[PDB]
Design an enzyme around this catalytic site. Sequence first.
Site, PDB file in Angstrom:
ATOM      1  N   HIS A 102      -6.638  -6.064  -2.101  1.00 17.61           N
ATOM      2  CA  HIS A 102      -5.611  -5.138  -1.653  1.00 17.61           C
ATOM      3  C   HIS A 102      -4.627  -5.748  -0.643  1.00 17.61           C
ATOM      4  O   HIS A 102      -3.417  -5.591  -0.764  1.00 17.61           O
ATOM      5  CB  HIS A 102      -6.217  -3.851  -1.105  1.00 17.61           C
ATOM      6  CG  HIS A 102      -5.191  -2.801  -0.820  1.00 17.61           C
ATOM      7  ND1 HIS A 102      -4.549  -2.102  -1.820  1.00 17.61           N
ATOM      8  CD2 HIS A 102      -4.732  -2.294   0.350  1.00 17.61           C
ATOM      9  CE1 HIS A 102      -3.719  -1.226  -1.279  1.00 17.61           C
ATOM     10  NE2 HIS A 102      -3.821  -1.315   0.035  1.00 17.61           N
ATOM     11  N   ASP A 139      -7.886  -5.582  -6.588  1.00 18.51           N
ATOM     12  CA  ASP A 139      -7.654  -4.549  -5.578  1.00 18.51           C
ATOM     13  C   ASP A 139      -8.714  -3.458  -5.679  1.00 18.51           C
ATOM     14  O   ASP A 139      -8.807  -2.775  -6.695  1.00 18.51           O
ATOM     15  CB  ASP A 139      -6.268  -3.944  -5.796  1.00 18.51           C
ATOM     16  CG  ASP A 139      -5.805  -3.059  -4.643  1.00 18.51           C
ATOM     17  OD1 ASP A 139      -6.631  -2.532  -3.864  1.00 18.51           O
ATOM     18  OD2 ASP A 139      -4.592  -2.834  -4.458  1.00 18.51           O
ATOM     19  N   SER A 159       0.842  -1.210   0.000  1.00 21.69           N
ATOM     20  CA  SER A 159       0.000   0.000   0.000  1.00 21.69           C
ATOM     21  C   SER A 159       0.873   1.255   0.000  1.00 21.69           C
ATOM     22  O   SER A 159       1.792   1.354  -0.809  1.00 21.69           O
ATOM     23  CB  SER A 159      -0.992   0.003   1.169  1.00 21.69           C
ATOM     24  OG  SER A 159      -1.309  -1.319   1.549  1.00 21.69           O
TER      25      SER A 159
END
Length: 408
Positions: free
Chosen positions: A365, A331, A237
């Site tokens: 994600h 994601d 991230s």
Amino acid sequence: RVPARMAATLILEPAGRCCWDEPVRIAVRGLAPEQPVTLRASLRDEKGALFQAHARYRADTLGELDLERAPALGGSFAGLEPMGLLWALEPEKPLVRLVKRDVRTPLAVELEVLDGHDPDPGRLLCQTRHERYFLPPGVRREPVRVGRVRGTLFLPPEPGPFPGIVDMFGTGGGLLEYRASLLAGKGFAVMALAYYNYEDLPKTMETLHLEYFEEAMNYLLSHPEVKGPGVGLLGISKGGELCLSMASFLKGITAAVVINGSVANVGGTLRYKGETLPPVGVNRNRIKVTKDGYADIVDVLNSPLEGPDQKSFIPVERAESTFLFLVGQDDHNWKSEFYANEACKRLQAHGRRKPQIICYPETGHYIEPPYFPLCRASPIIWGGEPRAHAMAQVDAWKQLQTFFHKHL
């Protein structure tokens, strides 16, 4: 008349200390021939939150149930899935992310064998506690408090020296140590690095100064047991975003594994000396409400390819580093594949090596270390399908190891 048979027994291989990222083989002996049973795995996290999975099985003609030999017939999963009781774990309360922060204590998985296939479980035929550890054998945990740098270093057992990696997670503040501690078990010195809202660090990330990250990497590189001449970077991230920023602006970065990172600078201003990257713009009208009461924010961030938002594009062409991008195709946090492709296009437009990109189908994600259960939503969705995501986590873990060993 001879006594009744002794109770059923669960047998695990390995029987002793198993790391969180390691497969275990589960067997039950002493059931009736072809006995229908339900296996149930239960875990409580450090916040007391319950995670559970179950599957129906049938013992063989010897009254043996071995999960590398017998398929799950249904429940949380089906098929020959030896680790399904772990990868299919689901929170009792929807929206709950698993909390594991102290790497020095194991997570226990309680395994129950229950009689029958009824939706309401029969009697408990046997049980065992399977502890899974986050500090691999002989891995040394060393907190870091040097200058303004805050993090935790994990080292393999002596002797060194070891290839060094800086490990970073995304927004949320604090310090997650569990990936670094597990990865040190593979022969790497790994510093889990904090950058806001932890100990005496700035409480917010309104502005981030790459000088802080340069200091962190220089500390790691200067360690008597870190090999060099450069370091690896591992980020997910905002942490992968920072891998790209670090590699673009700083020297000493040999290789970087970027997991669902962004090539746009997001959520704050980045500064390095005379240079600045403004946050990429947002458009909350691009939010989608579907197909429950959950937000889908994958389209909210503006493209760093047009308008004033080009200013927020991380100048990856300035990086000397080798890159591996691990992306979840599903994601829903942000457009990870798009970011990876645009980094690749920027790099090639300047004659840099073409980076490897691995795109995992139906993976979201949060690509965590292996056997961490999928969190679908926590509210917004993150993407991923349980089995596909689980197998992406298992594969990504092998991919980054191979990559870091090769370059470091």
